[PDB]
Structures are given as C-alpha cells and as structure tokens.
Design a protein around this nucleic acid. Sequence first.
DNA 1: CGATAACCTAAAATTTTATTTCAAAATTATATGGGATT
DNA 2: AAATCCCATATAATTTTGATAAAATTTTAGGTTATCG
Lengths: 316, 316
Amino acid sequence: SMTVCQLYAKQIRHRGNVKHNTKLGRERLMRILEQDRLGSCPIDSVKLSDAKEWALRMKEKGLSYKTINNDKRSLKAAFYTAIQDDCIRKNPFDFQLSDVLDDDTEPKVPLTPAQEESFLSFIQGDKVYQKHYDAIVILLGTGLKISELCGLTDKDLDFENRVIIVSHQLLRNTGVGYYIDEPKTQSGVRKIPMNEEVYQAFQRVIKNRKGAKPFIIDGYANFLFLKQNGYPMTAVDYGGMFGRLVKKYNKSHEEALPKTTTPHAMRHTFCTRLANAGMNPKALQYIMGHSNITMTLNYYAHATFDSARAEMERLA
Amino acid sequence: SMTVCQLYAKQIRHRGNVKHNTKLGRERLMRILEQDRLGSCPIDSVKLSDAKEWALRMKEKGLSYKTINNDKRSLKAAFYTAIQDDCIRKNPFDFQLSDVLDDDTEPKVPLTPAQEESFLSFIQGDKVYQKHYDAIVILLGTGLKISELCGLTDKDLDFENRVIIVSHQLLRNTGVGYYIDEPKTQSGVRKIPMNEEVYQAFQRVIKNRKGAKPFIIDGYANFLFLKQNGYPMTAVDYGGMFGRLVKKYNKSHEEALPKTTTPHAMRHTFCTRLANAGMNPKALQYIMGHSNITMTLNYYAHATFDSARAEMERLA
DNA sequence: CGATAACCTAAAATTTTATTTCAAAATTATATGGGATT
DNA sequence: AAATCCCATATAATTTTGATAAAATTTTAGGTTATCG
C-alpha cells in the first residue's frame, strides 16, 4: 500500500466486519481519493501540508465541513495503521480541522410549540398527507428515529401496559433490499411509554392498515407502516414525503418551518422539550437511547452564574 | 531508555512541565520500579504477560486498585513513547486491569441529612473542634475543595453580592513550603453564591481572625483560615483534624460516620444533595468546577424504565 | 504517673480529575420517470 | 394540452452517533505539648 488509495483499500479490507451503509460510505470516500490528486501520492511523501490542502480542496469541491471532518478521521485512522506497520513515522492528519476551515454548519433549530401545533393542524387538514398524521404524532411523542419507527411490528407494541419495545431497525438499500439491524448487547434495547395521543395514534394505524404484501425478514413480519405498494416504509420514503409536505406548508403559511424540518427534527424537538422542562438527564438518556450521556446533555442549555444561583436558591 | 526505569526516567524528563505534586507522584512510581523486578528488564523483552504479573505483585504488595491502575497508565504512556521511537512493537500495557485484578475500592458513601445535622451539632458543642465549625459549614454549603478553601482571602469574598470567587488554591509541601496554583484559562475560575448559613459563617471567620503573621505568596495575602502558628491552613492540616474529630464523634455516638469521612466527603455530600434534589446538571457542573459534564453526571442515579416513565408522566 | 488527647509535619499512600474521538452507521437531498391531480 | 404534484427509487450527499497520568487529597509515624484518665 504505497499510494493513499491502496492504503485506504488495505484499511477497509482489514476491518471488514461492517454494515451495508458503512460499505457504501467507504466507497464514497474511495471515489474521492481516486478523483483527488492526493490518492496518487505515495504515503511516505504525504506531509502535514498535503493533508491540509486536501481539506481545502474538499471544501472548494463543495463538500460540507462535517463530511470533510469525518473523512479526515477515516484517513487519519488509515495512516495510524501504516504507522503501526513501520511505513511512516508521523501521521499527516493529526491536525485540527478548524484551523484550516471554518465550520459553517447551519444549526438545526427545533420546532416551537406554536409551530408544532400549526404543523400538525395542517397535516390533519391536508387531504394528501393526513394519512401520515399518525406517524408524525408518534415521532413527536416518542423520539423514535425513523428506521426504528419503520421497524415496528405488532409484536413490538404492548397496549396492555402502553409500552413501545424498541429492539431493532428496518433498513432498505439498493440491491440488497430490506434487512434488519439490531444491537449486539441489551443496551440498545429500550422501552418507550405511550402517552394518550401516541396510544390513540397506534390504534388508528393498526385499524387502518390495509394491503400488506407477504413479507418477512430476519423473523420480523406485520409491520405497522406500509407504502402504497404494500411493503413497509423506509427512511428514504419518509424523507421524500417530509420534503413535499414542508414545501406545501410553506406555500400557504407566512412563517416557514425551519430549513431542516426532516424526520429527525421530530426527534430533536422531542428531546428539546423534555430537556427544557427539566427532565432527569439519565431518564431522558434512556428514552432517547443515547449511548454516551454527553449526547443527551448537548440538549441542555449552557449554565451561567445567574442560572446556577437561581437553581441553588430554588433548592434552599 | 533500555531498562524500564531508564525508559520511565526518559518519559518524565521529556515531559517536565508538571506541578510539584506530579513530581512527587512520579518519584513514588520510580521507587516502585527500582524495587520491583520489572524495573530491570530491557524494554524489548517486556511481554504482555510480564505487565500483568507486575500488577499482581503490586496488589500483593498491598497497593490499592486505583493506585495500580494509575501507575499502569503511566507505564503505558512511557511505552507508547518507545513505540513512537522505534524501540518496541506492541505496547505490553495495553490490557484491561479488570481481567487481572478485582476492584475492591470501597465506595465513598456520603452523609445523610440526619448524620449531617448530628455531625454539625457535635462540632458546635465540642470544646476542642468548635473553632472549625465555620469551615465545615462552608464546605457543606459550597462544595469547595480543601485547598480552595485554604486559598480564600479577603479579596476573594464579596459580601455585597454574597459571592465566593474561586480563582486559585493554596497548597503546601515539604521543602518548597506554600505556593499558589491558578488555572491557565479562565475556565477554572468560578463563582459560588452564599446561603444564609454560609454567609453567616464567613462573618464569624473574619471577626475571629487573630494572630496572623506577615505572609504573602504569589501576590496573595490575608487568608481567612489560619493555624494556631499564625500561618494559613493546608489540606494536610484539615485532614488530620478531620481524622481526630471523627474518632471523638464515633466514641459518643452509636451509629459511626462513614469510614471515608474526610474534607472531600463534604464536597461529595454537597454535590449529592443538589443532584438528588434535581438541580440542573449543567448549573451544578458550574458550581462544582467540573471540567467535563460526565464528572457531574456520576452523581445522578441510573434511570430505570419505571424511573423514566414516571418522569414522562410527570411532564404531561 | 501514665495514657493519650491535640498539633505539627515528613513521608507514603489513595483519590479525584484531565484533554478526550485511530469513522462507523445512520439520515437526507436530489435527479429521473412514470401516474395523478392541477 | 401545458404545468405541477405525488410516489418510488438509484445515486450522492449530510448528519447523528459511539485512558497515550496529572494533580489533587488523605493516611500515618514520631515528636512535643496540653489535657485527661
């Protein structure tokens, strides 16, 4: 592995136990190297300046900051493997990316209650999207990621105790089609309770289910949420639906919805509400399914001296 | 850097920008290496099996779990330096200490409200330790570490706004005597409000100050808390004082106080109270001085499904 | 008169804290084309 | 009839997510002194 492409090729073959989406992503970076001048350099000649100039090119190509930072970390790990193989001494990607580029990531603004009520009223009223009203309510009332919602089946709901049992996701990719991913341990499994509006939503979704094709994958069947074609919804299908729905909303409402009103924005709103209401962080972390509690805590506003003093006075 | 001792000696010389307590700690580990068989081995002959046996000896010697794990981290860093200088291949200290030793660290259980009210009652009434009643109230009402308390001077209190300005600590060591450690960035400096009890206790500390000798160090003078000898209290002095206070308490009380009832215990109790009361986690992280929000979240009890459900029901 | 409480402190130990991604794996945007509704 | 949604999906992109010890605190041992047994 003397060329950078060959080195990355060696890295991903050595670390092959990955998911289908990971194989796609690696392919995307491999194409970047093949097109970029950096992929041709021998690894023993790649200097810290070459890696930085690579980033400037990626930004000039039009790739976002988060993309360029993620790919930098892939390359960094690749060169750390060539270091442990006695090919080079220093790792030319061991620099801070913010020193070279500015992070212009557009913040993801959650929905405000006023907007949320407005957004839902439009959905239930609209004759084309009202059929998705139930899914949106469930998203907003549970924090489910989109492929966890798609993976729900009759065996995952418990209406006696009003609990959602989140144990897997249903995914779909080109070629392979549908498949099920689930956690290796029992930590990714969580149980989310249903409030009155979520409980009533699942009831409507089960009563109105119609036209299900014969479908079973990795032992899972009888999914709650189906496309018109009789097969279950996928993340992409909801993404596309949200885009058209938001576009239709902004045409008739003066105040448009945030630019990034996607399915995850429902999870973001759900988490922001609970945090600002002062939910026990460890409890919120359970509902959300976060592994590191740092993830959950990013949803709590930074504290100030006056912030803290108020809290201490509030607690005698 | 052929023997392990010579290697460690190189790791500390190359990384010399350390505080006095670090120099003491490294010296302690150096003694262990010089007394242990492992100190004599050539680094190119230290196998993973060898490092594990070192830990067994340390535990056989009587060193606690955390000590051995801390020292293991030191040795590991030293071998990463040798691996980066092309002296060895793999790091023989890259293993989980859990697999060799069990962690018998006795948990530090904080004071229950009933204990605290009893502990303070005894101090106020005791003819010998009543003079320290004020320092202990402040410890319990502010969460100050012990060397931050010893560092408090008139210029650090603000009785108008009733705020403590923590910006430094006062330390003392054999030979060097006293010195002041401040944070590099203004992130370690924080401000703590005074409750009635605490503000009332600072007034007593200043009215009763007596017998101060001329003393200024790194620009700091007029310290609130002083030994009988006219110089300020140090961490050690409060430690020994706490040790005798607890002994005298456990003689006249049936239910003894926790084994680890030290000055830091007061910081522990303070933090546990606010966490259990449901204080904003990031507001508590500010008051405490924790640099990472993970350190503060350790004081919150893990959540259960029932714990989480009751919280979501509470936030209708 | 002795034992030991109370302070002080050198020496020796334990405990509290410190920067944290050596990319995977998901989600979303978009171009296209064939129906359905303007 | 021209134009615009609505769905579905391949393709391409963005976003979410999962200790490489220093520096403090505390314990203890030995001595003096003051207090108590």
